[PDB]
Write a protein that binds this ligand. Structure first.
Ligand SMILES: [Zn+2]
Ligand SMILES: [Zn+2]
Length: 68
């Protein structure tokens, strides 16, 4: 029972998300830089940061009070 609205999306559907698959929520930091642009899986896809391209020496999952 609609008129013809074939486009229902929020103001902005992009923020602190993966810049590789933009499908899953990034929950891993790429230290040192500590950039979260790689999903739990994409984190292994690129040994470096897809933003700063810094040799990833250590990586940990946020798993904190920071979530949407
Ligand atoms: Zn991803
Ligand atoms: Zn980075």
């Amino acid at each position: 029972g609609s008129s013809g609205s074939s486009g229902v999306e929020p103001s902005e559907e992009n923020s602190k998300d993966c810049v590789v698959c933009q499908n899953g929520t990034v929950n891993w930091v790429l230290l040192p830089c500590r950039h979260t642009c790689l999903c739990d899986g994409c984190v292994k896809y690129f040994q470096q940061c897809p933003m700063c391209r810094q040799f990833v020496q250590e990586s940990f999952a946020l798993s904190g009070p920071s979530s949407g």
